[PDB]
Amino acid sequence: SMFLPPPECPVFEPSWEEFADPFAFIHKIRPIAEQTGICKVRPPPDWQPPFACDVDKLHFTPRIQRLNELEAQTRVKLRDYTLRTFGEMADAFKSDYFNMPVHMVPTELVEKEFWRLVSTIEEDVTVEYGADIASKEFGSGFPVRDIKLSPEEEEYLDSGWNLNNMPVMEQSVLAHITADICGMKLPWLYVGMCFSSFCWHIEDHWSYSINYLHWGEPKTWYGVPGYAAEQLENVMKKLAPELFVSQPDLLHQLVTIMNPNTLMTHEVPVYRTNQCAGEFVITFPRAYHSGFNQGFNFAEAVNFCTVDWLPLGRQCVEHYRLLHRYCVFSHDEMICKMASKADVLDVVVASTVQKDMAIMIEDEKALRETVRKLGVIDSERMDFELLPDDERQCVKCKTTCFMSAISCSCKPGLLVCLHHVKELCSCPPYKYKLRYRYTLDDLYPMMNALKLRAE
Ligand SMILES: O=C(O)CNC(=O)C(=O)O
Ligand SMILES: [Cl-]
Ligand SMILES: [Mn+2]
Ligand SMILES: [Mn+2]
Ligand SMILES: [Zn+2]
């Protein structure tokens, strides 16, 4: 009555033939899983990456977490615990909370107890957790090249499901990006304890996310399919409007804990799963997800973008602009970078990039005609990729400029995208300059190179 568990998400058990290539597999399970938002992947029994670490030499600074529903939390972005001392803290917490041996507590009990304690205004439970990019003080759980590796570790060095390799595997379009997006293309490490949770969110630029539980007690997930993303946001906007005020920057995104039953009440489809050790969880583009840890564990997650994502990546940047939210990178700069590397691209990748570039060129053509009719006559080429991102964001909608922007001598250093020409300054239009990366005559050959590559 208190908590009705959402239905279970799809669970996939691929064979070795299927499991070999992750990108082919994901593209194969996409019709099913994009209807549920999240899905679980059980690797073949023989696939078992070795986990070896010294629990005494791995430290990390813990993050503190209050467990209150609808309360605002800042999203994690870019004394200490050793992994042993944290684990002793975590196990003692759960053991004392339930007065039971940590592993005799049912996962469904912890679930209903989590949703009890977060709604109860009386309870003041705070927990700690670890969340960070791999460093010298705390490295990846997967094998990496560096030290002498055992023959079994060498098996999994070049694996596709080694989340260190997934970003740069040449089917992830995030691989050829040279701009700094370290918080996006590098794996995150999550050290969890009982009730430690991650609030409702989607990935930056609506990218995929893949999560591997190396070891420990399960991680409980809740997922919402991408098509219901705005349904969920409406439900949340009503209950918690505090989360939807304009963010000063990217380090100030507000997220929250909210009961799935509340979403299911408003006809938002929600799915759940328990991710156990050695299992993958995959979230699809714009699929909202949240959850909590059943106890002491260690997870590793990374974002990635396939060819299927490219159109969504464009729609997302459009949506970011409507909301005046900062981008992590320029979508167009990425597209043009791949166009300039057409000869070395995968041919299916080149085909998809071409289609997106065709749309980009069509839009840019229309926008430049529009600003010309606004009086902007003067123009000059400008290498936007050389500018730090904070120096090339639209004054109005905060979008990162690459294809074009408008500048004015009256307001030096300031820029606006071509959607917000009126927002630059109070000077007449002939004082404006169109700053462009490419002429339309530069762009069509670039697209042609993609077409030839894709045959
Ligand atoms: O494991 C966590 O704490 C949170 N993980 C994610 O949000 C993800 O893998 O996409
Ligand atoms: Cl509470
Ligand atoms: Mn996530
Ligand atoms: Mn506007
Ligand atoms: Zn703008």
Question: Coil, strand, or helix at residue 246?
Answer: coil
As given in the structure block, the two tokens for residue 447 are 């697209």
Same domain for 137 and 115: yes
Same domain for 120 and 83: yes
- Residue 135: which H helix or E strand, with range? none
DSSP 274: E
Question: Coil, strand, or helix at residue 230?
Answer: helix
Q: How far apart are CA 366 and CA 348, in angstroms?
A: 28
Same domain for 397 and 408: yes
> Pocket around ligand 1: residues whose beta carbon is below 6 Å from it?
190, 198, 209, 211, 283, 299, 301
Same domain for 344 and 288: no
Compute the distance from residue 189 Cα to the ligand 2 centre, in Å. 26
Boundary of a domain, candidates 298, 327, 356: 327
Between helix 440-453 and helix 331-339 the angle, nearest 10°, is: 60
Judged by its nearest atom, the ligand closest to the C-alpha of residue 299 is 1
Q: What is the distance, to the nearest Å, from the Cα of residue 398 to the centroid of all Cα atoms in its chain?
A: 19
Strand (E) positions, 241-360?
254-255, 271-275, 280-283, 289-293, 297-304
Which sign does the torsion angle of CA 237, 301, 58, 214 carry? Answer: positive
* Cβ atoms 374, 421 nearer than 8 A: yes
Boundary of a domain, candidates 327, 344, 377: 327
Compute the distance from residue 319 Cα to the ligand 4 centre, in Å. 11
* Cβ atoms 128, 136 nearer than 8 A: no
Question: Coil, strand, or helix at residue 304?
Answer: strand
Which residues are CB-contacts of 248 (< 8 A; sequence separation ≥ 6)?
Answer: none
Same domain for 39 and 89: yes
* Cβ atoms 391, 413 nearer than 8 A: yes
Q: How far apart are CA 83 and CA 273, in angstroms?
A: 26
Same domain for 264 and 227: yes
Same domain for 258 and 138: yes
Dihedral angle, C-alpha 327, 331, 336, 339, nearest 10 °: 140
Which sign does the torsion angle of CA 368, 370, 372, 374 carry? Answer: negative
Atom of ligand 1 nearest to the CA of 198: 3
Same domain for 341 and 223: no
Q: Is 407 annotated as a binding residue?
A: no
Same domain for 146 and 167: yes
Same domain for 309 and 354: no
Question: Which residues precede a break in the chain, with C-to-N distance above 2.5 Å?
Answer: 78, 146
Q: How far apart are CA 317 and CA 297, in angstroms?
A: 35
> What resolution in angstroms, rounded to 1 decimal?
2.4
CATH of the domain at 197: 2.60.120.650
Same domain for 347 and 259: no
Q: How far apart are CA 144 and CA 255, in angstroms?
A: 33
Pairing of strands 38-41, 11-12: parallel
Dihedral angle, C-alpha 118, 123, 124, 126, nearest 10 °: -50
CA angle 92, 93, 95 (to 5 degrees): 65
Return the biggest CA–CA distance within the chain.
76
Q: How far apart are CA 367 and CA 399, in angstroms?
A: 15
Compute the distance from residue 315 Cα to the ligand 5 centre, in Å. 15
- Residue 177: which H helix or E strand, with range? none
Atom of ligand 1 nearest to the CA of 289: 7
Mutate to test the pocket of ligand 1, among 188, 195, 210, 214 (most ligand atoms within 8 A of CB): 188
Q: What is the DSSP string of 372-427?
A: HTTT--EEEE--GGGS-GGGSB-TTT-PBPSSEEEEESSSTT--B-TT-GGGS-SS
* Domain ranges, residue 447: 328-455
Q: Is 201 annotated as a binding residue?
A: yes
Q: Is 122 annotated as a binding residue?
A: no
Q: What is the DSSP string of 4-68?
A: -PPPBPPEE---HHHHS-HHHHHHHHHHHHTTTSEEEE---TT--------TTT-EE--EEEE--
Q: Is 129 annotated as a binding residue?
A: yes
Judged by its nearest atom, the ligand closest to the C-alpha of residue 405 is 5
Q: Is 209 annotated as a binding residue?
A: yes
Same domain for 57 and 13: yes
Number of domains in the chain: 2
Which residues are CB-contacts of 404 (< 8 A; sequence separation ≥ 6)?
Answer: 364, 367, 368, 417, 418, 434, 435, 436, 437
Which sign does the torsion angle of CA 167, 173, 177, 182 carry? Answer: negative
* Cβ atoms 213, 277 nearer than 8 A: yes
Boundary of a domain, candidates 327, 357, 379: 327
